């Protein structure tokens, strides 16, 4: 499925998500986010699953942003974990964490938890 | 804090993390888990902020292995999140997902949620 | 928003939701889900936030099932944490944890996370 | 394990949860959080699995506050998903959502997760 996740997809929010998978099982790309502390496109990295299994389950994978660029920086960092569903209306589920930087005393508030679903067609 | 990051973190459960942080923000590096469909060392990839706030904050990073080696095959992938903190006793605090390839209809059951902090002493 | 809350929501699984909310801020009812080692109606409780802001904010709740009752026993309890959202389609946006009782050596996989959004009708 | 949960039980953050375990699997009591937009005690409701496995497994819970009393509301409610273990140095592993009031646009940023451990001694 490196043909079928390398793309561009959007979420739900419609941030633009442009990944390659290579043969080796990274992913290399950019994450632009349509929400947030966030201007224009950020590096993302991450791996997923290049044999996976053949009984119609999904292809694990995650990537990471963090959120700093040439314009901005957050002081923050999101990973994505979830799986690619090929075929008709392909689709990466994910759920998600987002950590800032923070102090000992806000440790407690620092990481946010969502789900993030992707398609190839911008909503 | 390229240099606060690089080097072999161990976890609470005797899990082994070594990574590579560049000046560009890239993380990479080995995952060997002492739980789990896992043996030996996975790679990694991630990204920390190269750049953090000067007010006590910690540094957000996060980083993903997927559990394929040359041995392996778990068809699942982990992420971790969270931030470094430094000073005399150093640590990396993350809380994690553990997403597992599953049918559309298992698909309700496919992610474990946790938490692993590291230090740079077992 | 008792008055709104208060009925039969269904999730997108098949699940069946249905709960009271009294004025003090209390869930009560009876929850159905349509997967896993679950039979029949399930006990469960939580708490809303009876007097929410007026700046067309959603409304804070949250409950629990522990999955015994007459019929099956899954040694595990799921947390639900959302939003209920009033208006013509109302809805309740949740995000679940699914803890199993587990040794100590096997807690790193205890605790499934997940997210369920409930409507009127289906 | 009905003895064993009731009681009360404090966290690494030093807030203090008053709880009841019922025969039935009920759990009511209160809880002070000693950070946040928390003031004095707030009323908990939840549930544990009062048949639990013999094999030497925690027994599953979970529990519900509402961030409003008498004095204070902030609009807001924390779940906390765990099992207790039992013995001398008593535990109760959670992970935790709090889940904030907000507007369609900003449910991305409304679910905060962490992990509380509950012990009987103060930290």
């Known amino acids: 499925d490196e043909a079928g996740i390398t793309g561009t997809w959007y979420n739900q929010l419609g941030s633009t998500?442009?990944?390659?998978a290579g043969a080796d099982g990274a992913l290399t790309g950019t994450y632009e986010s349509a929400v947030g502390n966030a201007e224009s496109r950020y590096v993302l990295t991450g791996r997923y699953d290049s044999a996976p299994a053949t009984d119609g389950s999904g292809t694990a994978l995650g990537w990471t942003?963090?959120?700093?660029?040439?314009y901005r920086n957050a002081h923050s960092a999101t990973t994505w974990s979830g799986q690619?569903?090929?075929g008709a209306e392909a689709r990466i589920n994910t759920?998600?964490?987002?950590?800032?930087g923070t102090t000992?005393?806000?440790a407690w508030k620092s990481t946010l938890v969502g789900h993030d679903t992707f398609t190839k067609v911008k909503p």
Chains 1, 4 share one sequence.
């Open 84 to 86: 690619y569903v090929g």
């Open 104 to 106: 000992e005393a806000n």
């Open 65 to 70: 942003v963090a959120w700093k660029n040439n």
């Open 17 to 20: 998500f442009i990944v390659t």
């Open 95 to 100: 759920q998600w964490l987002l950590t800032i």
